[PDB]
Amino acid sequence: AQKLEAKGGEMGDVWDDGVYENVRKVYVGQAQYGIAFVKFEYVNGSQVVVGDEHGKKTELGVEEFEIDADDYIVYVEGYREKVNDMTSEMITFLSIKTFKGKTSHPIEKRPGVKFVLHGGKIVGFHGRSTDVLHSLGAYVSLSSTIKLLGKWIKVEQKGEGPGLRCSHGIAQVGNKIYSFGGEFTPNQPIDKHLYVFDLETRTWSISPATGDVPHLSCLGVRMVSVGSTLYVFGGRDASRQYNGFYSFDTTTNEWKLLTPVEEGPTPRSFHSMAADEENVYVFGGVSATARLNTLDSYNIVDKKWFHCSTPGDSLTARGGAGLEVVQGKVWVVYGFNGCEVDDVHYYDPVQDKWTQVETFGVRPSERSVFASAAIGKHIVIFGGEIAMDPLAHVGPGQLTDGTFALDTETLQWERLDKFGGEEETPSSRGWTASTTATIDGKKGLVMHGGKAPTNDRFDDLFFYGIDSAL
């Protein structure tokens, strides 16, 4: 399979259970602060393999977590920390997620760093213990049976690009992809240009413009395409001043302030957006004062904003969540509310009401600001932030790299990442501007830009192309 780095203080006796067919049972014995004692019971062929213990038990006892035979571990989430002011970090908290969606303990915010051994199937463990757990890794085996077959392509680029940024917005119109807004240094919007990408040329340039050009250059902005006209909302500049709701006729190349701030929906940034041929949707994100959970629709024909039913407590205010129209319905996926979140919800237009949905099977650990597109009955997501940065949107935070698709018709998540092929899978990133797109006659996901794990920026253009079977 694949050994994953054990994560924790590198003090202690290293242990390695090796790799098995699957995991039958997990044993966790708590320490006084963190984790004392682990043990695993595995299965290999027709053989139950009871494993050695690692660390020593405490007066607390040891809790068991049995994994059904029709069932396996998709990830282990945890918290490492240097406590006692003791020379080494130790592992302080663990949660187990099961393919069937069993979960051992609900994740909680504990100080220290979060880590996660992720991806499709945990088939064994290894770590380092000194009479208590000090670090932990595991072995993951990516499942070979990838339902939504497809590959990752690093699109080449030529012109005057939007280059290196994140917290910007992209949309497709015809065979051209448009970009707008964004940040390069922490919290500093770059320009007001509307960059455009000719697919057949694979080349960039600044679009020409007319009319009501956006009043402020900004970041945390969103935009979606309807027909050949682009629609743009929110964002902020350096001075926490907000943009209203504009549009851009691409055949006409003219801007248009469709509704002013202070007229339409609450001015905000790092909201989410989508469109369905008839309305343009705006969800959540951060207002001047609070995160939001509200959603507003704007009919193009009726040229007018409608305020949708409010979800209340069921669905906590959030930003950096994914929003796609999966079918006839709006989908809210994951996001951030002080904690990173792995909620899933749909809003039904016809009824004007919200529904929560349980989801299962090799699901992503909770995360924000990821790349997302809806294609078919699927939502596809890549990367994202799996833990906020202490210093704000200022610092990198912790950023990951999985590729996942939600099947809205079965509620099975799958990880589109393969062992098997050779392809240019994007490196761990977040705050990407992402969209659904057709390129060289394949629909799929268009990742662009984003924050690096090292607080750098990216400029890459990435495409998960869904091969032809569809």
Backbone angles phi, psi at 123, to 5 degrees: -115, 15
Q: What DSSP string describes 372-422?
A: EEEETTEEEEEEEEEE--TTSTTS--EEEEEEEEEETTT-BEEE---SSS-
Give the torsion through C-alpha atoms of 263, 264, 268, 270, to 10 deg. -160
Stretch (H or E) spanning 463: strand 461-465
- Report the half-sphere exposure of 329 (CA within 13 A, side-chain side): 21
Q: How far is CA 454 from CA 156, 254, 450, 458, in A?
A: 23, 38, 11, 11
H helix or E strand, kind and range, residue 162:
none
Contact between 363 and 74 (Cβ < 8 Å): yes
291 labelled as ligand-binding?
A: yes
Q: How far apart are CA 174 and CA 198, in angstroms?
A: 10
Query: In what helix (H) or strand (E) does residue 240 lie, and over which residues does it extend?
Result: none
429 is catalytic: no
Q: How far apart, in whole angstroms, are the C-alpha atoms of residue 146 and residue 467?
A: 12
User: Would you say 385 is a known binding-site residue?
Assistant: yes
Tokens 């939001």, residue located: 292
Resolution in A: 3.0
Return the biggest CA–CA distance within the chain.
74
Q: Is 367 annotated as a binding residue?
A: no
Which tokens sit at 191? Answer: 């320009």
Contact by Cβ (8 Å): 299, 279: yes
* Whole-number Å distance between alpha carbons of 242 and 420: 46
**393 among annotated binding-site residues:** yes
Please enumerate in sequence order all residues whose Cβ is within 8 A of that of 28, keeping only pairs 6 or more positions apart, or say none: 35, 37, 38, 62, 63, 65, 94, 104
Among 126, 118, 130, 117, smallest CA distance to 84 is for 130
Annotated ligand binding at 236? The verdict is yes
Record the tokens describing residue 370, joined without a space. Answer: 């990821």
DSSP class per residue in 174-208: TTEEEEE--BSSTT-B----EEEEETTTTEEEEPP
Our CA dihedral for 29, 33, 34, 40, rounded to 10 degrees, sits at -10
Annotated binding-site residue? 24:
no
> Shortest CA distance to 332 belongs to which of 360, 364, 353, 356?
356
* Contacts of residue 39, Cβ cutoff 8 Å, sequence gap at least 6: 27, 29, 51, 52, 53, 54, 62
Beta bridge partners of 118: none
The 10 Å Cβ neighbour count of residue 142 is 17
Tokens standing for residue 93: 């908290």
- From 80, 128, 236, 268, active-site residue: 236
CA separation for the pair 192, 218 (Å, rounded):
7
Among the listed residues 80, 222, 291, 457, the single catalytic one is 291
Instruction: Concatenate the DSSP letters of all residues of 425-453 into one string.
Output: PPPS-BS-EEEEEE-SS-EEEEEE--B-T
Phi, psi of 12 (to 5 degrees): 140, 180
**Cross-strand pairs, 465:** 151, 444
Q: What is the signed CA dihedral for 369, 375, 377, 381, rounded to 10 degrees?
A: -20
Are 10 and 93 a contacting pair, CB within 8 Å? no
CA 78: distance to chain centroid?
18
Q: What is the distance between the alpha carbons of residues 302 and 298, in angstroms, rounded to a whole number?
A: 8
Q: Which SS3 state, helix, strand or coil, does residue 235 take?
A: strand
User: Which sign, positive or negative, has the C-alpha torsion 267, 273, 279, 284?
Assistant: negative
Q: Which two tokens stand for residue 306?
A: 């409608």
To 5 degrees, how large is the angle CA 9–CA 13–CA 16?
A: 100
The tokens describing 127, both together, are: 């770590």
Q: In what order do the strands lie in the sheet with 304-307?
A: 272-275, 279-283, 295-299, 304-307
Domain boundaries, the chain: 1-144, 145-470
Query: Pick from 436, 420, 427, 381: which is nearest to 401 by CA?
Result: 427
Q: How far apart are CA 168 and CA 433, in angstroms?
A: 5
Q: How far is Cα 226 from Cα 244, in angstroms, rounded to an integer? A: 18
3-state class of 466 per DSSP? coil
Residue with tokens 């990173």: 340
Q: Is there a binding annotation on residue 297?
A: no
Q: How many residues does the chain have?
A: 470
Positive or negative, the CA dihedral 270, 445, 308, 221 is positive
The technique by which this structure was obtained is X-ray
What are the φ and ψ backbone dihedral angles of 198, each rounded to 5 degrees? Answer: -85, 115
What residue type is assigned to position 411 of the chain? L
Is residue 143 annotated as involved in ligand binding? no
- CA distances (Å), origin 467, targets 102, 326, 437: 33, 20, 13
Is 354 one of the annotated binding-site residues?
no
3 state DSSP class of 313: helix
CA distance 345 to 330: 8
The answer to whether 76 and 107 are in contact (CB under 8 A) is: no
**Residue pair 243/232 in contact by the 8 Å Cβ criterion:** yes
Residue type, 361: G
Asked about 236 being catalytic, the answer comes back as yes
Q: Where are the beta strands (DSSP E) in 51-168?
A: 62-66, 73-81, 90-98, 113-117, 122-129, 133-140, 151-155
Q: State the residue for tokens 């070979």.
A: 144
Which CATH fold would you assign to the domain 1-144? Answer: Vitelline Membrane Outer Layer Protein I, subunit A (2.100.10)
- Under 8 Å between Cβ of 209 and 194: yes
C-alpha distances (whole Å) from 123 to each of 5, 91, 192, 197 are 14, 20, 50, 44
Beta strands in 209-285 (DSSP E): 219-226, 229-236, 245-249, 254-259, 268-269, 272-275, 279-283
Of the candidates 463, 383, 469, 382, the one whose C-alpha atom is nearest the C-alpha of residue 423 is 463
Chain breaks in the chain (C to N over 2.5 A) after: none
C-alpha pair distances (Å), 139 with each of 66, 73, 265, 338: 18, 11, 47, 31
